[PDB]
Amino acid sequence: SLKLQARLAADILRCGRHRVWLDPNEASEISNANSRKSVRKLIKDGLIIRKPVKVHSRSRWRHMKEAKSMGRHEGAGRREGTREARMPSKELWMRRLRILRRLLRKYREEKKIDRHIYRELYVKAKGNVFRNKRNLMEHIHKVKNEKKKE
Amino acid sequence: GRFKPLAIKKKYAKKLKQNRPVPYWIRLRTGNRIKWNEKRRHWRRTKLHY
Amino acid sequence: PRVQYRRRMHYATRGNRMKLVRTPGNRLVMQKRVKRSQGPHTPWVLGHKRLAGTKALRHTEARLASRHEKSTSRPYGGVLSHEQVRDRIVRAFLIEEQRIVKRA
Amino acid sequence: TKGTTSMGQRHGRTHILCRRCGRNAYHVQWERCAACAYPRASRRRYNWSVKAIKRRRTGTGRMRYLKEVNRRIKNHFKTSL
RNA sequence: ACUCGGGUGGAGGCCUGUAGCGAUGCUGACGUGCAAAUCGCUCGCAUGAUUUGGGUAUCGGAGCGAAAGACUCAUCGAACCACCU
RNA sequence: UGGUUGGCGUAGCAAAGAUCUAACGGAACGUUGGAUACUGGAGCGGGGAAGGAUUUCGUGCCAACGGCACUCGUACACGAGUUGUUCGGAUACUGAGCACAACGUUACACCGUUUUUAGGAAAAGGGGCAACAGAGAACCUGGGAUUAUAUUCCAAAAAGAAAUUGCAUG
RNA sequence: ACUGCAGACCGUACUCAUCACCGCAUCAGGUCCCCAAGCAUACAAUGCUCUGGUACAUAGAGAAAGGUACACUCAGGGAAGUCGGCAAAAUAGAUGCGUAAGUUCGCAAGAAGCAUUGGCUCUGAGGGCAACAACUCAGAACUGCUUACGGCGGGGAAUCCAACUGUAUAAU
RNA sequence: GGGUAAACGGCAAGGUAGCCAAAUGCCUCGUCUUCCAAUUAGAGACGCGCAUGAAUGGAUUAAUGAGAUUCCCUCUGUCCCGAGUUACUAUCUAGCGAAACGACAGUCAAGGGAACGGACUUGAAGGGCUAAGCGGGGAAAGAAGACCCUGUUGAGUUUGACUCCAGUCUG
RNA sequence: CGGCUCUUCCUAACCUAGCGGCUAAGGGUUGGAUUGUUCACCCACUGACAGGGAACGUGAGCUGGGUUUAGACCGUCGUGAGACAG
RNA sequence: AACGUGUCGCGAUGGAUGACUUGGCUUCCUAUUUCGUUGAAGAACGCAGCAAAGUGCGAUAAGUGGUAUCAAUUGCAGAUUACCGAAUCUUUGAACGCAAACGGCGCAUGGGAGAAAUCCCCGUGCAUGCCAUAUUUCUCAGUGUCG
RNA sequence: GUGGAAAUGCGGCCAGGUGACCAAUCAAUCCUCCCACGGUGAGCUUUCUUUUCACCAUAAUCCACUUGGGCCUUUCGAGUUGUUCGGAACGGGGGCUCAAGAUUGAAAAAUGCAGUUGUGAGUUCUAUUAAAGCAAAAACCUGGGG
RNA sequence: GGUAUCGUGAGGGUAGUACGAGGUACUCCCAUGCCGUGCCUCUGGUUUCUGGAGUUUGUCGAACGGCAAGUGCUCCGACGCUAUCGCACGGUGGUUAGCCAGUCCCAAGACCAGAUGCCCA
RNA sequence: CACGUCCCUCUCCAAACGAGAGAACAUGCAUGGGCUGGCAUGAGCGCGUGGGGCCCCGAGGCGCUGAACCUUGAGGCCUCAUGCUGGGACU
Ligand SMILES: [Mg+2]
Ligand SMILES: [Mg+2]
Ligand SMILES: [Mg+2]
Ligand SMILES: [Mg+2]
Ligand SMILES: [Mg+2]
Ligand SMILES: [Mg+2]
Ligand SMILES: [Mg+2]
Ligand SMILES: [Mg+2]
Ligand SMILES: [Mg+2]
Ligand SMILES: [Mg+2]
Ligand SMILES: [Mg+2]
Ligand SMILES: [Mg+2]
Ligand SMILES: [Mg+2]
Ligand SMILES: [Mg+2]
Ligand SMILES: [Mg+2]
Ligand SMILES: [Mg+2]
Ligand SMILES: [Mg+2]
Ligand SMILES: [Mg+2]
Ligand SMILES: [Mg+2]
Ligand SMILES: [Mg+2]
Ligand SMILES: [Mg+2]
Ligand SMILES: [Mg+2]
Ligand SMILES: [Mg+2]
Ligand SMILES: [Mg+2]
Ligand SMILES: [Mg+2]
Ligand SMILES: [Mg+2]
Ligand SMILES: [Mg+2]
Ligand SMILES: [Mg+2]
Ligand SMILES: [Mg+2]
Ligand SMILES: [Mg+2]
Ligand SMILES: [Mg+2]
Ligand SMILES: [Mg+2]
Ligand SMILES: [Mg+2]
Ligand SMILES: [Mg+2]
Ligand SMILES: [Mg+2]
Ligand SMILES: [Mg+2]
Ligand SMILES: [Mg+2]
Ligand SMILES: [Mg+2]
Ligand SMILES: [Mg+2]
Ligand SMILES: [Mg+2]
Ligand SMILES: [Zn+2]
Structure with a gap:
């Protein structure tokens, strides 16, 4: 009845009882292992072993994580969530606007664009008159060539 | 839990060492009446609510 | 890794x-996070x-801090903003100068 | 749910042991004893309950000194010099 | 004259709904029960007059009540204990 | 009031899915291995408060109890076990509050105010209490350290490393 | 700076729960706090899984009637049942359309109502830092359906009452 | 003597605006219309309103509602009209093991009778013991009927009952 | 109270049968709208939709709509608490 | 047949009964009979070689001392009984230095250990009210009365 | 006492501060999680699998030293995801300073473990209603004055 | 006396009913309804043959194969059970429509000296 | 003790349990086969959206393939083939 050692093995294997393995074939030598120091002798001595944690593979998932990248498993039937839960409008607006405010800020820093037009666009960027970076990227180009002519 | 005034710990300590079977040799005295301890307590039954 | 409290208190106050x-032992261990004061x-x-x-020293360590860690070496140094001192240095001077004129 | 399910709602103590009587009758919130009336100097004692007067009167305890002074009055307080 | 787009923002005794707090219906189970009021599903509220621990205050011809004579230790159209009895 | 009875070996012991196997043990359910499921992180997880107060742990035990059984038990018996300058608490905060004092009232203090018609300093407004979730609050890890405690134990290479309080010392 | 000595008190085990507390119990009830993984998913819903835990809820054999169920299915009909659509079914996610009366102009509204939705192989879009990073949306062919988890509103038209959220006879 | 009804209330004044067989209408299922094959229902009108009506608030109201109510679509075992399957029970076993109840019992028909017998009269049945059901009877059990009445019994509430007592105010 | 459910018995017979009103208790006597109902009245079928008893058959069979205690609303009554077989 | 019924004989369950009674109840009496700030009663915690309770006691702890008495106590072991003067009498409690679900914390006094003093233990005092007194006549306060 | 033009750096009483008080969000770290790489161990292995799983740890304390804010100075734009801001000083250059944080190292590899970093996500911590405005105090700090 | 077998049948139960069409105004036909007694070939329903397939999420490293989702879900699905939702069947004699007997159902506590088989230490 | 009945055991037209029907060395049971059915074309290897540098990746598709599997079990068929084979109670 080596229920004590199993208490002990689990503690000094630094795991649960579920993982510790008391050798079925040598219950008696395990049986007289009253001290943690006795059991530690049994652990090096191989009567007691910690089993590896039961596997929980991600290979099904990583293979899925490939297919999702390629757009698999994406469509209408595969969507529980509202389009806003599934990807927040505030999340897009921040990203969109942090990006615009940064590019306006990059040109103002290299002065590709006037410190004047920066307000002209910093404030239009906030009214999403610019869908993208390259929408603003070309507006800065065409808001500027209009100046180049004069 | 942990908390106990020592006065309560002294009392549970009191009732704890008081919670003992009668000595065997006491029953062998002349004119003895006692057999079992009539004041055995069990935590799961009588409560020493302190 | 799930953690539990170590100090005898157990509330998320x-x-x-x-x-x-x-x-270092690869335990994951809650530690008291200091009660920072402004x-x-x-x-x-x-x-x-x-x-x-001035530093935001907890008074638990403020006693052991150097005196100038809790001040600047200016009048009202641990008490007032520099503008607030200058507000007074002006207000002391200018107000007295009007009173010195109200004798005339 | 006034029965067994509200018995679980009750969690505190009204009374802890008294410093005098040792009864679990010390109302912790009104720091007094329901039994001895402690901290009041004069101990609680009612004639409508003599079963309780009797229960805690003198002779109920050791009468630790009173045995000594009783023996002395009986012996005229006889004394060695 | 201050309106029509579009975004932004995150308001509300706002909505759906967890937890939690309830408790409508089945007049379901149980009904000498698991239970001296419970179980199941259903359902209601769930940012608020919300829920909740500790502490503290207010009670018996009294307290407390968004008020049902409700609750005040399974006791309330007057608790419980003892006593008169 | 005690005992006993029929009903009656009956009504039932049907909520939460679950055990199987071999080996061993034993006088005959446990233990281990394997298998199989379950919980499914708002857990039949790991720590605490209240509460409980020895239930902890080991050995033994299984008479009684664990509504079946037990070889097992939170049961029984015996022996153990809880280690702190730093954790929490007090020392040492105040809070809703409370109440000693005094004073007043009451046939009566077991009432009330909570400062007292009041000389409250002993070397302007008396004393105290009231929070283990508020304020305060000097310590960390490693351990081969237990049957059972550890931020508490470890020993001179303190495994070690700190911070901190008091006094004193150059 | 240093060093030297000293650093006292009490708590400390265990529990915290379908057997350790309250409920006469190892009672399906009640009981504050903290930590809290992976996958699907919008998710602390739900399902399932590593870790940590369990395998304790008396068991066996077999499968009358009648029951209980957090079990279904039912031809044709479709509320005729009933006091009463009670109970059950039904709706259902997301996207795009579309949305009436009435209105205090907020709403009503998820009104209502159609519609598309898988798999797969592609495409497009959306950024960062200098001189590599997401993962949503969008589209396209091809192809598949037994319409095939879980979870998830039934709707409408009216009358009475109360304006609203709320409270409230613990145990009809 | 005066004032006061968003005092109690009425409709001294005689019910105004409204609204209704309304949760308020006896008559009554009112009458008409609408809904159906058919409607004591509903909705909408009507108003001889037993007994509507204005902060004892009147009317009307979008939104809200586990509120009452009617109908509709969908839907279905609600039903026609039940059938089949599941799992746990029940059933049988091993273990364990109550309770309620319990005068005594316990087949009926007629009769009589405290006026509906298990005991009596006269007939008719009935071998005994069982197991599972069952729910007709045992006026089955449950609790000295919560109904009602009685008592020179209670308590709660009310009050312009009797008797008072604080409070208040006045002197 | 009612229904539902199930059985049963009666006949001053509704249908059916035999007669010429009589005999005849045999077997049968519908499905629905309103309403708790019974009852009534309607719609439809039907050969017909007869009337009754069985503790106004039948609640340890159910259902709980009626009656329905406490909650509440209205009308009327009441100075009021409260009453109303409304 | 069986079950069931019944008689009898034994036996179990049960605990009446009878006898017993170091208990109660009631009556009567006696006296050098009436607690406590010199810490009472009550409560707590402890003390025996094995001792939980009860009793006894209080860190001098089922007792120390005095007295009488005697040879025991007695479950085992091991080498008393009765009374009463001297003491001992822990934490508390009117409880009183301040508190108190704290075995907490003071101030002053003396001691102790100790130690590189700080810490630590201990004893005693330290509540309020009131009366007396300041016996070598304490220190004071009042726009009280005067001087 | 003292440096610095300045922001500021270093070496009884009185008044002020800390105590001290907000949902969220944003950001940083924390943490957890994922991925990539690399190692190490284990497992699958009929077939297939450069594969699946696990692990790759870094304590307080101390020492040197990017983001957000305040400020100094000097010579219509600024700004946030967002309801702002600016001669009562915006922006730009340099500086100061706070708050987090990073890295350098001491601890500390004599430990752990067993026979590596980095990268992504989440978590974490540090306005609104308001006729609601969202404790106190000791301790402690700093000053003014002495 | 056992055991067994075939029967007897006192007694008790007891049921068929209605409608319509044809044919000619009885007979005679032919369907149906209800009732009743069965049965399951067919047809429908039912699936825990979880049979076979498909399929969703989780999971087993993957394919295969599974597995979990309290039978995951969808399709088909035998056996069986069952439906007026299928199908078969529902008979006479005698007395005064009744009624009785029979057929039909239980039938020896109706105690069958009915028969019969076997053994009767 | 006879005959025999019963139990145990096996089968099911029976069945809550008793009872019933049967068996009693028997194609009885067991697997297997054949069949009748069911489903619906297995595993495995060997035309195609495009894609990657002649092949590879590719859902789906094709071929072997009315295949695969299942088919008596609360109890389909076939003797077709092999396999395995009394004790107790009572009078
Ligand atoms: Mg306690
Ligand atoms: Mg109560
Ligand atoms: Mg409470
Ligand atoms: Mg809301
Ligand atoms: Mg809702
Ligand atoms: Mg009332
Ligand atoms: Mg039973
Ligand atoms: Mg699971
Ligand atoms: Mg144990
Ligand atoms: Mg014990
Ligand atoms: Mg206060
Ligand atoms: Mg305090
Ligand atoms: Mg605190
Ligand atoms: Mg501390
Ligand atoms: Mg432990
Ligand atoms: Mg612990
Ligand atoms: Mg817990
Ligand atoms: Mg208990
Ligand atoms: Mg989840
Ligand atoms: Mg959940
Ligand atoms: Mg159907
Ligand atoms: Mg209907
Ligand atoms: Mg109807
Ligand atoms: Mg009907
Ligand atoms: Mg419903
Ligand atoms: Mg509109
Ligand atoms: Mg309302
Ligand atoms: Mg209620
Ligand atoms: Mg009308
Ligand atoms: Mg009115
Ligand atoms: Mg509401
Ligand atoms: Mg009576
Ligand atoms: Mg009279
Ligand atoms: Mg009287
Ligand atoms: Mg009746
Ligand atoms: Mg009845
Ligand atoms: Mg003792
Ligand atoms: Mg004291
Ligand atoms: Mg570190
Ligand atoms: Mg067979
Ligand atoms: Zn007391």
Whole structure:
């Protein structure tokens, strides 16, 4: 009845009882292992072993994580969530606007664009008159060539 | 839990060492009446609510 | 890794904030997160602003800190913003100069 | 749910042991004893309950000194010099 | 004259709904029960007059009540204990 | 009031899915291995408060109890076990509050105010209490350290490393 | 700076729960706090899984009637049942359309109502830092359906009452 | 003597605006219309309103509602009209093991009778013991009927009952 | 109270049968709208939709709509608490 | 047959009964009979070689001392009984230095250990009210009365 | 006492501050999680699998030293995801300072473990209603004055 | 006396009913309804043959194969059970429509000296 | 003790349990086969959206393939083939 050692093995294997393995074939030598120091002798001595944690593979998932990248498993039937839960409008607006405010800020820093037009666009960027970076990227180009002519 | 005034710990300590079977040799005295301890307590039954 | 409290207290109050901490022994261990105080401020009636030369020492360690860690070496140094001192140095001077004129 | 399910709602103590009587009758919130009336100097004692007067009167305890002074009055307080 | 787009923002005794707090219906189970009021599903509220621990205050011809004579230790159209009895 | 009875070996012991196997043990359910499921992180997880107060742990035991059984038990018996300058609490905060004092009232203090018609300093407004979730609060890890405690134990290479309080010392 | 000595008190085990507390019990009830993984998913819903835990809820054999169920299915009909659509079914996610009366102009509204939705192989879009990073949306062919988890509103038209959220006879 | 009804209330004044067989209408299922094959229902009108009506608030109201109510679509085992399957029970076993109840019992028909017998009269049945059901009877059990009445019994509430007592105010 | 469910018995017979009103208790006597109902009245079928008893058959069979205690609303009554077989 | 019924004989369950009674109840009496700030009663915690309770006691702890008495106590072991003067009498409690679900904390006094003093233990005092007194006649306060 | 033009750096009483008080969000770290790489161990292995799983740890304390804010100075734009801001000083250059944080190292590899970093996500911590405005105090700090 | 077998049948139960069409105004036909007694070939329903397939999420490293989702879900699905939702069947004699007997159902506590088989230490 | 009945055991037209029907060395049971059915074309290897540098990746598709599997079990068929084979109670 080596229920004590199993208490002990689990503690000094630094795991649960579920993982510790008391050798079925040598219950008696395990049986007289009253001290943690006795059991530690049994652990090096191989009567007691910690089993590896039961596997929980991600290979099904990583293979899925490939297919999702390629757009698999994406469509209408595969969507529980509202389009806003599934990807927040505030999340897009921040990203969109942090990006615009940064590019306006990059040109103002290299002065590709006037410190004047920066307000002209910093404030239009906030009214999403610019869908993208390259929408603003070309507006800065065409808001500027209009100046180049004069 | 942990908390106990020592006065309560002294009392549970009191009732704890008081919670003992009668000595065997006491029953062998002349004119003895006692057999079992009539004041055995069990935590799961009588409560020493302190 | 799930953690539990180590100090005898066990409530998620503001004064009992804790920090999860992987240890050298590869334990993951909650540690008391210090009850940081904001530091010295100019007085509440003067807009209550954090002072510049002063550290936000907890008074538990403020006793052991150097004196100038909690002040600047200016008049009212641990008490007033520099503008607040200058407000007075002007207001002391200019107000007395009008009174000195009201004798005439 | 006034029965067994509200018995679980009750969690505190009204009374802890008294410093005098040792009864679990010390109302912790009104720091007094329901039994001895402690901290009041004069101990609680009612004639409508003599079963309780009798229960805690003198002779109920050791009468630790009173045995000594009783023996002395009986012996005229005889004394060695 | 201050309106029509579009975004932004995150308001509300706002909505759906967890937890939690309830408790409508089945007049379901149980009904000498698991239970001296419970179980199941259903359902209601769930940012608020919310829920909740500790502490503290207010009670018996009294207390407390968004008021049902409700609740005040399974006791309330007057608790419980003892006593008169 | 005690005992006994029929009903009656009956009504039932049907909520939460679950055990199987071999080996061993034993006088005959446990233990281990394997298998199989379950919980499914708002857990039949790991720590605490209240509450409980020895239930802890080991050995033994299984008479009684664990509504079946037990070889097992939170049961029984015996022996153990809880280690702190730093954790929490007090020392040492105040809070809703409370109440000693005094004073007043009451046939009566077991009432009330909570400062007292009041000389409250002993070397302007008396004393105290009231929070283990508020304020305060000097310590960390490693351990081969237990049957059972550890931020508490470890020993001179303190495994070690700190911070901190008091006094004193150059 | 240093060093030297000293650093006292009490708590400390265990529990915290379908057997350790309250409920006469190892009672399906009640009981504050903290930590809290992976996958699907909008998710602390739900399902399932590593870790940590369990395998304790008396068991066996077999499968009358009648029951209980957090079990279904039912031809044709479709509320005729009934006091009463009670109970059950039904709706259902997301996207795009579309949305009436009435209105205090907020709403009503998820009104209502159609519609598309898988798999797969592609495409497009959306950024960062200098001189590599997401993962949503969009589209396209091809192809598949037994319409095939879980979870998830039934709707409408009216009358009475109360304006609203709320409270409230613990145990009809 | 005066004032006061968003005092109690009425409709001294005689019910105004409204609204209704309304949760308020006896008559009554009112009458008409609408809904159906058919409607004591509903909705909408009507108003001889037993007994509507204005902060004892009147009317009307979008939104809200586990509120009452009617109908509709969908839907279905609600039903026609039940059938089949599941799992746990029940059933049988091993273990364990109550309770309620319990005068005594316990087949009926007639009769009589405290006026509906298990005991009596006269007939008719009935071998005994069982197991599972069952729910007709045992006026089965449950609790000295919560109904009602009685008592020179209670308590709660009310009050312009009797008797008072504080409070208030006045002197 | 009612229904539902199930059985049963009667006949001053509704249908059916035999007669010429009589005999005849045999077997049968519908499905629905309103309403708790019974009852009534309607719609439809039907050969017909007869009337009754069985503790106004039948609640340890159910259902709980009626009656329906406490909650509440209205009308009327009441100075009021409260009453109303409304 | 069986079950069931019944008689009898034994036996179990049960605990009446009878006898017993170091208990109660009631009556009567006696006296050098009436607690406590010199810490009472009550409560707590402890003390025996094995001792939980009860009793006894209080860190001098089922007792120390005095007295009488005697040879025991007695479950085992091991080498008393009765009374009463001297003491002992822990934490508390009117409880009183301040508190108190704290075996907490003071101030002053003396001691102790100790130690590189700080810490630590201990004893005693330290509540309020009131009366007396300041016996070598304490220190004071009052726009009280005067001087 | 003292440096610095300045922001500021270093070496009884009185008044002020800390105590001290907000949902969220944003950001940083924390943490957890994922991925990539690399090692190490284990497992699958009929077939297939440069594969699946696990692990790759870094304590307080101390020492040197990017983001957000305040400020100094000097010579219509600024700004946030967002309801702002600016001669009562915006922006730009340099500086100061606070708050987090990073890295350098001491601890500390004599430990752990067993026979590596980095990268992504989440978590974490540090306005609104308001006729609601969202404790106190000791301790402690700093000053003014002495 | 056992055991067994075939029967007897006192007694008790007891049921068929209605409608319509044809044919000619009885007979005679032919369907149906209800009732009743069965049965399951067919047809429908039912699936825990979880049979076979498909399929969703989780999971087993993957394919295969599974597995979990309290039978995951969808399709088909035998056996069986069952439906007026299928199908078969529902008979006479005698007395005064009744009624009785029979057929039909239980039938020896109706105690069958009915028969019969076997053994009767 | 006879005959025999019963139990145990096996089968099911029976069945809550008793009872019933049967068996009693028997194609009885067991697997297997054949069949009748069911489903619906297995595993495995060997035309195609495009894609990657002649092949590879590719859902789906094709071929072997009315295949695969299942088919008596609360109890389909076939003797077709092999396999395995009394004790107790009572009078
Ligand atoms: Mg306690
Ligand atoms: Mg109560
Ligand atoms: Mg409570
Ligand atoms: Mg809301
Ligand atoms: Mg809702
Ligand atoms: Mg009332
Ligand atoms: Mg039973
Ligand atoms: Mg699971
Ligand atoms: Mg144990
Ligand atoms: Mg014990
Ligand atoms: Mg206060
Ligand atoms: Mg305090
Ligand atoms: Mg605190
Ligand atoms: Mg501390
Ligand atoms: Mg432990
Ligand atoms: Mg512990
Ligand atoms: Mg817990
Ligand atoms: Mg208990
Ligand atoms: Mg989840
Ligand atoms: Mg959940
Ligand atoms: Mg159907
Ligand atoms: Mg209907
Ligand atoms: Mg109807
Ligand atoms: Mg009907
Ligand atoms: Mg419903
Ligand atoms: Mg509109
Ligand atoms: Mg309302
Ligand atoms: Mg209620
Ligand atoms: Mg009308
Ligand atoms: Mg009115
Ligand atoms: Mg509401
Ligand atoms: Mg009576
Ligand atoms: Mg009279
Ligand atoms: Mg009287
Ligand atoms: Mg009746
Ligand atoms: Mg009845
Ligand atoms: Mg003792
Ligand atoms: Mg004291
Ligand atoms: Mg570190
Ligand atoms: Mg067979
Ligand atoms: Zn007391």
